[PDB]
Design an enzyme around this catalytic site. Structure first.
Site, mmCIF file in Angstrom:
data_model
loop_
_atom_site.group_PDB
_atom_site.id
_atom_site.type_symbol
_atom_site.label_atom_id
_atom_site.label_comp_id
_atom_site.label_asym_id
_atom_site.label_seq_id
_atom_site.Cartn_x
_atom_site.Cartn_y
_atom_site.Cartn_z
ATOM 1 C CD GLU A 14 39.942 42.568 31.012
ATOM 2 O OE1 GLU A 14 40.663 41.541 31.012
ATOM 3 O OE2 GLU A 14 40.414 43.728 30.910
ATOM 4 C CG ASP A 21 37.063 42.782 37.978
ATOM 5 O OD1 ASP A 21 36.677 43.039 39.135
ATOM 6 O OD2 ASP A 21 38.104 43.269 37.499
ATOM 7 C CD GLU A 76 42.373 38.091 29.803
ATOM 8 O OE1 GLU A 76 42.998 37.179 30.379
ATOM 9 O OE2 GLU A 76 42.224 39.227 30.293
ATOM 10 C CG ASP A 97 44.461 40.560 28.007
ATOM 11 O OD1 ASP A 97 43.711 40.861 27.054
ATOM 12 O OD2 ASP A 97 44.145 40.729 29.209
ATOM 13 C CE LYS A 116 47.575 43.626 29.408
ATOM 14 N NZ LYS A 116 46.257 43.028 29.789
ATOM 15 C CG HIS A 126 40.379 41.432 35.095
ATOM 16 N ND1 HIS A 126 39.952 42.639 35.608
ATOM 17 C CD2 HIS A 126 41.408 41.718 34.262
ATOM 18 C CE1 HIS A 126 40.692 43.612 35.107
ATOM 19 N NE2 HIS A 126 41.583 43.080 34.288
HETATM 20 MG MG LIG Z 1 42.409 41.209 30.239
#
Ligand SMILES: [Mg+2]
Ligand SMILES: [Mg+2]
Ligand SMILES: [Mg+2]
Ligand SMILES: [Mg+2]
Ligand SMILES: [Mg+2]
Lengths: 357, 357, 357, 357, 357
Positions: free
Chosen positions: E247, E270, E221, E195, E166, E297
């Site tokens: 996602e 997703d 992302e 992300d 992250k 995802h």
């Molecule tokens: Mg993500």
């Protein structure tokens, strides 16, 4: 109902000869105040300003043109009054000084509604967070580097944790040295922004952007003149910087054009020339829909209420505090909008009479 | 060098019945005159005007904000003076009434340069054809159909061979009948144009165009507000009519935006608000480059020289003569630019004196 | 009225060493002069030129095709004459050498109108600033580096504070070294510009821009052929340089195309091929509208009046003086438009007589 | 501070089996009410609805997900609470039923601020005109032509002077007959609009537009599904009609996408699913900047306050009045927003318990 | 035919430390399981989930709104059932949680069709390669650098040869150091992705990309909010990185918008919120058409079959196993789609029973 409308014009001299790339020498700005009294004795305060010139023109617009749309009108219908004003000064207007005149009146009308409802404007508007981040904007283009650093020190001492300096010197080399100096003085993570005040050409602006890239400037303000949508969009696509502008745009449409064209990345309206809180919030909405942050220009004592009521606001410009009853104080980089009814700004009109023109 | 600058404001009373769709009723326009005198004693006449309001403000800008750019300056450097006035009233300006003030000064400066060169302005600008075709613009929206025809005959009686009428009545059915009447009355071959004065919405304007198409109108002016570039361009693609606009555009940039976006098909600048001859000519150049014709709005007495110097002009609007010495006459649908030094306009300041405010 | 039109062609011999990337070596340019006389006996001087070829054809158009639009026509109606000459040579024309012929006539007509108004053209056009900044354009591609520096000093010696050099050598490595040398030689702060004369391909031009970026060139002129709007616009988005062009554009439309497409960032019209002052000014207006500066190419003696009358001019190219009476001198990087009636250029037709063909 | 949050779900059966081109058979809609009580005893009312399904889901969202963002929070910071709610239901949300849930709460919060400030919402918002034009929207797709005309009669009898009927029958021929019937029944100047409820394909919608052109319909609503930006923009460019849509858009961004893409000409947000008054006003601003009018969908008793505070509003949809204390009455085509504090809507919760699920 | 539909909600407790930039801390996700039984007695398993909130609402939509489209319907007509569920929850839906409910049902229907065909879903979908490459997505923003490396080794220990971390810490300097650390730690050749979870503004995202470019990140992302098509496209042109997103996109149209506008370079749907396999596959087709790769995802156990059936898949995210019988193992960076009928996922409803709400 509005029973009284007092328009006054003051020449507030400045403590230093503030200077920039185009406006020249600022030795005094013109303050135009507007006091609207309703049938219940309440009085709303509104005001705007100019630099050097145009003051008498704005004041004359309020006193001679707008008055007739105010006296005897229901002061609670602000939107209705705004349109009537927009149309009264439309012929030969539709932008220009007329919007400043309107902004002052508009601000007064909201102040009045805030008093009547016994509630601060930031809450009347919906309310987000009364704690608004700020930055100090110096009009230091002619200020020697050393004096630059000094002023920087006072801003810090004064609670500011973000600073904006002027750029747009004839030789980009001088701007690069000064910006380099303050980035080292202030440090790596200090939010430092620049304002060229429309001084560069489109090619020049982009050239200057490459040169200032190393210093990670928080943003570049008004690289070129605001009117050129195509050129500004080009500066946005090529300068790798946040591009701030808006203080010279005077209508909702100007902002709409800029946003649609992508000729700016950060909207910067001035509540005192954009059309008051009425148009300011509309511009704010435009920004929110376009996933942009929102900053401001001028009269932060009035502006704090708008930014406290929007979720996407960022560093507000908070460079007249002498004539104010309880001006806000900057603490650790932020200010807090007061909770008094209306905008809470009270001017010492007795002391101001001293400076009336 | 400039040694004198005299600014005067006059409330010229307008007859009842003069009405359009958005401004309401024309009560009285305000004439802001500017007389400039240089070292050698020659004087240049320039002027602007507003409808209903803003006059006092226009005069204030010239007399208080601009005089400082005139007195002592070389009157022969019109372009230099133009740019300095644009910048002096830039803060809170950059459009609006300030461009009307600037136009007044600009127009007088050209007149002075013409007086000095001993040549009419149309020749000084280049020289195309002094015989400029014209049309009569009626301010007749609330005017009964019958009277509208009566007004028509009066225009033919005056030499006009082209007529514009107002449209934008609340119900489109009224505009169609009235338009059908005048079409029916004038004959299909007579140039008839309609002005909506920004009354319609984008859809409404398109809806009105379908309705009026049968009558083969020469053009539709200001179908909606001028600020809407996208909307006005949509009206252009969908209405099948020549789209006239520009009286409310106050900068060269406004015209650039409109043209680039194709939000209008026929530029209609007003020499007294666009920035005088200086800016008017630059707008004409844009129209020539884009293969467009060029028309105009207001003060045809001053404007005649502009269009008589450009190759793509078309019917000029020529609806204040009582105050002039040698007003052009309308003959067989055209007027003729006088060959007197400057613009050749002379005002009876004695009779006008009676109307100062 | 016009009573005389004298057209003469001269083969002015050019020294060896004058060379660029695509035209080859400058052997000799051909001067086509046009002297016009009206009823009152005043004469207007206008002229154009070509490099190596086309001269005899230019002269033929004026003398045989245009004379019929001049003799007996009112010389005061420049715009009228302009349009009629454009149309007389329209079949198989609409651009090309014919615009050079037209420019010659146009320039002489303006000179005559200035002579008659007893005022320099720069003032007659409006009046901005008679002190126009300049630069020296070397035709030095095959010139040894050493000589290139020697040429540099000679330009500084002449008062120039800005220099352009040719580029486009077959191998990009040569241009980089030479450019590095002059940059090294002049100091980084001295305005240095390069002209490729259409030598590069779109990719090549972009590739050359990366290579030259270190030296901070003031601008890159004609990177590729002018006809390629798409390609030139790509060069604009990708090269990070001011892109100059326009010497080879021969109509207002060419300039409109280029600007609208953003295929160049700095318009460079040549008053002697673009259509004279008449068209030059219309191109200047497009540049002003688009927030662009304005430069120029060739015959600076005539051009000075153009740029001295527009607000956004920049370094004028001022590289035929032996044949002039009072040639402007270069002082501290600028030249000054003479205040004599017309353009103030006087040619020694005696000495030129020796070169007629 | 919010001390109580009551969420209730009711199944309000309808007086007639209302029907359309896609939603099928409406025999009962789900009402979700939200009552927020602050630390002073005041209680704000908010609510939303669904048709047939999704009700329990929304109610569950308020009661189980949003409650935790409400209890103990300062109810005067509506903008702050909105964002927190938007983010709480963001994962798997960001549109959909979550926006309805949020809208109900949002409405309650504003009601509460309106009560506290002792002032109606239309005034709290700024205030334009409490008199809002209206139209009746029938869910009559399966209603026989004769019953169509009858219902038309009752609407008239009820004060409505503008009507919207359903279209989207399998055979466009049937829609053309019905629309033709009501245009003759209602008359030439009667505002008649249609709603296809997303029933047509892009080509079908355009085909239907040509066919219905003769009847001058005030507008066509939701020609195709709302998700297709490209297709709708095509329907706008080709159907020669006002294109209304928005009731199915659920975020500020959806409206922003539609407006930017020009896939609709008249924004039609539903305050009860768009995000409450908070987002509704933002959409309103977007519309104003784009020179568009603004209409609405559903809960006009709540919506009247929003439209009364904007200048560009038009015919509001005003098709639960039984459970209301003082529902507004339609007079001569308009309604008047009440002046009680908040939105002034009071529901008979005792009588409603009868219908709780 | 469908005879049973069992919907259950589980509160699976999530360890502390799981955190990102905008959602805050992962307390616990809510598992909504759907088991469907048809006439012959076979049961299909499908499920979805939410983080922190919305679970009860998801379950409510299936159990109360959708069950009516399942019971008694032919389970073999997945597409028919899909469209009817989309429309049943369309009012106030058309996106949001409702698509998660729909996905759950869809997934179980495919499982049932696979169970019946006695074939793994990846083969039933077409059949590409059952060995799908993977990466580990850490929810580690507030995780100390040291621990971050420790987490890294644990992932390598688990078989992963690609890791995502992250980013979006308040100060960009923190993200750079941490990213430098893991880059330094993993070796430049190891696929490392970041992300931001919509944390950055458009300018900020572009500013962050310059900062991270040195480390050669495999992809970035969700740099900003997904709703901003224009902004996300700008991030694509300016950041020089593969841009992953999807996602939070909940309809095929969202993906169509994003792709058409080029607002992302790598689609990341997703399966449990996009609409199950039915819609997931349609999104894959868009990615193939546009020459894009396809990632994913969540719930890799179900997703594996999707990507194992498309040719352009890439690293699948495979971060609930304790509740499964035969969870895939990670070997040499890949996983292998089991060949058991259906998706092959079996949940321990006994152990889950302990967590129902
Ligand atoms: Mg993500
Ligand atoms: Mg600024
Ligand atoms: Mg008009
Ligand atoms: Mg060249
Ligand atoms: Mg509808």
């Amino acid at each position: 109902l509005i029973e009284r409308v007092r328009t006054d014009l003051y020449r507030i001299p400045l403590p230093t000869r503030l200077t920039d790339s185009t406006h020249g020498a600022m030795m005094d700005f013109e303050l135009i105040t507007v006091r609207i009294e309703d049938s219940d004795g309440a009085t709303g305060l509104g005001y705007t300003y100019t630099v050097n010139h145009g003051g008498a023109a704005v004041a004359t617009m309020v006193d001679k043109d707008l008055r007739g749309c105010l006296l005897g009108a229901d002061a609670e219908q602000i939107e209705k009054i705004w349109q009537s004003m927009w149309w009264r000064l439309h012929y030969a207007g539709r932008g220009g000084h007329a919007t400043s005149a309107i902004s002052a009146v508009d601000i007064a009308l909201w102040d009045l509604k805030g008093i009547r409802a016994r509630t601060p404007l930031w809450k009347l508007f919906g309310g987000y967070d009364p704690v608004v981040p700020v930055y100090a904007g110096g009009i230091d283009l002619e200020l020697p580097v050393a004096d630059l650093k000094t002023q920087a020190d006072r801003f810090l001492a004064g609670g500011f944790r973000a600073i904006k300096m002027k750029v747009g010197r004839p030789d980009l080399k001088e701007d690069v040295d000064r910006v380099s100096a303050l980035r080292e003085h202030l440090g790596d993570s200090f939010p430092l922004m620049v304002d060229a005040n429309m001084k560069w050409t489109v090619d020049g602006a982009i050239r200057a952007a490459r040169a200032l890239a190393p210093f990670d400037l928080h943003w570049i303000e008004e690289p070129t003149i605001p009117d050129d949508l195509v050129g500004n969009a080009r500066i946005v696509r090529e300068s790798g910087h946040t591009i701030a502008g808006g203080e010279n745009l005077h209508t909702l449409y100007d902002f709409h054009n800029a946003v649609r064209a992508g000729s700016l990345t950060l909207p910067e309206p001035d509540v005192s020339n954009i059309g008051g809180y009425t148009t300011f919030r509309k511009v704010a909405a435009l920004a929110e829909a376009n996933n942009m942050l929102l900053t401001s220009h001028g009269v932060h004592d009035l502006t704090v209420h708008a930014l406290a009521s929007v979720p996407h606001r960022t560093y507000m410009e908070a460079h007249l505090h002498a004539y104010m009853a309880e001006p806000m104080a900057v603490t650790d980089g932020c200010v807090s909008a007061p909770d008094r009814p209306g905008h809470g700004v009270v001017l010492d009109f007795e002391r101001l009479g001293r400076l009336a023109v």
